[PDB]
Curated annotation (Swiss-Prot), chain B:
It comes from Homo sapiens (Human). Testis, thymus, prostate and heart. Transmembrane segments: none annotated. DNA ligase involved in DNA non-homologous end joining (NHEJ); required for double-strand break (DSB) repair and V(D)J recombination. Catalyzes the NHEJ ligation step of the broken DNA during DSB repair by resealing the DNA breaks after the gap filling is completed. Joins single-strand breaks in a double-stranded polydeoxynucleotide in an ATP-dependent reaction. LIG4 is mechanistically flexible: it can ligate nicks as well as compatible DNA overhangs alone, while in the presence of XRCC4, it can ligate ends with 2-nucleotides (nt) microhomology and 1-nt gaps. Belongs to the ATP-dependent DNA ligase family. This is DNA ligase 4. The chain holds residues 761 to 911 of 911 of the full protein.
Swiss-Prot record, chain C:
This is DNA repair protein XRCC4. The gene is XRCC4. Its main location: nucleus. Widely expressed. Residues 180-201 are annotated as: Interaction with LIG4. Changing residue 90 to E: Abolished ability to bridge DNA. Residues 131-165, 184-201 form a coiled coil. It comes from Homo sapiens.
Length: 193, 151, 201
């Protein structure tokens, strides 16, 4: 799963941060595979498409608002209750006050396994995104070099065209001034001779 | 030279005549704007597609902040206006001066405030113009007008 | 002094993991402080000099590759070149990961590790640093692809302008040639007219 560990705060220990592992199940409405760890216990809750469709409109409030709350929070002022294994927190915002989802999490006895999953996904994501960044520097450098080369090509084209136009105009001015001198000489000859 | 006084010269004659003349541009860019630009003026060639900025002097808008010539914008195609200006007899003055008369606004339009500072210090006031006046004009091989390309 | 995330895969302990979150000093060829953790107990310790290479001779492999391999195993990413069975023994507080060539017990490094009580905050910081690097890499990808699109668009625009200019500059120069042709033709017509007038003058 896309088990992204997102930092959350405890109810009694705000300074010590739990990492709400925001996973994926190919769907976003059904929440995520919510695995939680503290270094002393594990909370691996497998919430599925069973407390979403019915829990969306149970409190006389729209599914869209419920799904919006899930996206804005499950994916701030976070609070986790260890005693009940139930991820609920005070969402003290504008017109929002309720237990966000009936997320009765499941707890496995060994925190080492959820720590395994967290560390594995963390380092895999670091490696994947570092390779992504590497070929992105590669592509960015390639396009920067291409753009600079074409800009220099246009520089050379403009310079060459301006030089050719200038020298052609100068030669034409020489020829035309000589022709005009001939014309005025013919004017003088017709006037006198 | 090979130029005659009674036999009309064609392209082949002109190329041979011009080839006979040595190639040397010993003339300062102001003089192309004054006399050589008048060749396209007195004989009505100022409407040429690729060289029509001969007497139009624009602002090479390639700086994030105007009146400073060190903050060149990188990764953008703002230098095309200067080369298009350099494609003709346009005096490419990189800073706001009396020459600047066609401010070709590129990817940043918030710089108009800095243009207001020097829009009164110089006689021929420059006007806020879009990229169509320069960047797309020579791409279309023309010379757009300020009124139809304002902003 | 920083902690580098190396989750060595324990074949002997698939349940209790072990991270060799090395907190190394400003030395690599000499004894480097390597720190370990499992999830509920961390194993820290200071590695001495001239003793870590005794097991390297027990390994009977190349030196210099020893320092690089220690860096690879300690830092992020287990090195494919010399794969060690990550037997981070909790039964001895000695995280031995060894390449037992020619089917014999050959030890790699003398690591004096001690079991502690609460590595929770340390592992929290470890995975937090991992995912902070992930987030900054994602933001880097975002602005990198933004710059990619911007440079591609500018490259296409400059290429189009350059192609049009190179294609039509020869035509423009030929137009100038024809302009000179017409001007000189009219000048020669005037010259011939004046010559004929002088013939009758």
């Amino acid at each position: 799963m896309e088990r992204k560990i997102s930092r959350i705060h405890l109810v009694s220990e705000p300074s010590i941060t739990h990492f709400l592992q925001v996973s994926w199940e190919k769907t976003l409405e059904s929440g995520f595979v919510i695995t939680l760890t503290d270094g002393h216990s594990a909370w691996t809750g497998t919430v599925s498409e069973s407390e979403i469709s019915q829990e969306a409109d149970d409190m006389a409030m729209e599914k869209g608002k419920y799904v919006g709350e899930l996206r804005k929070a499950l994916l701030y002022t976070f609070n986790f209750s260890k005693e009940s294994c139930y991820f609920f927190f005070e969402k003290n915002l504008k017109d929002v006050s309720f237990r966000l989802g009936s997320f009765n999490l499941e707890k496995v006895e060994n925190p080492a396994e959820v720590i395994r999953e967290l560390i594995c996904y963390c380092l895999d994501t670091i490696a994947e995104n570092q390779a992504k960044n590497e070929h992105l520097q590669k592509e960015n450098e390639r396009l920067l070099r291409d753009w600079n080369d074409v800009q220099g090509r246009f520089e050379k084209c403009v310079s060459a065209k301006e030089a050719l136009e200038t020298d052609l105009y100068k030669r034409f001015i020489l020829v035309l001034n000589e022709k005009k001198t001939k014309i005025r000489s013919l004017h003088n000859k017709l006037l006198n001779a | 030279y090979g130029d005659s006084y009674f036999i009309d010269t064609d392209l082949n004659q002109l190329k041979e005549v011009f080839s006979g003349i040595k190639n040397s541009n010993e003339q300062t860019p102001e003089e192309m704007a004054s006399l050589i630009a008048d060749l396209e003026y007195r004989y009505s060639w100022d409407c040429s597609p690729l060289s029509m900025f001969r007497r139009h002097t624009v602002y090479l808008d390639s700086y994030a902040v105007i009146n400073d010539l060190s903050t060149k914008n990188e990764g953008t195609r703002l230098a095309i206006k200067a080369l298009e200006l350099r494609f003709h007899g346009a005096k490419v003055v990189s800073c706001l001066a009396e020459g600047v008369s066609h401010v070709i606004i590129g990817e940043d339009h918030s710089r108009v405030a800095d243009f207001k500072a020097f829009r009164r210090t110089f006689k021929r006031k420059f006007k806020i113009l879009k990229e169509s006046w320069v960047t797309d004009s020579i791409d279309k091989c023309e010379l757009q007008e300020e009124n139809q390309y304002l902003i």
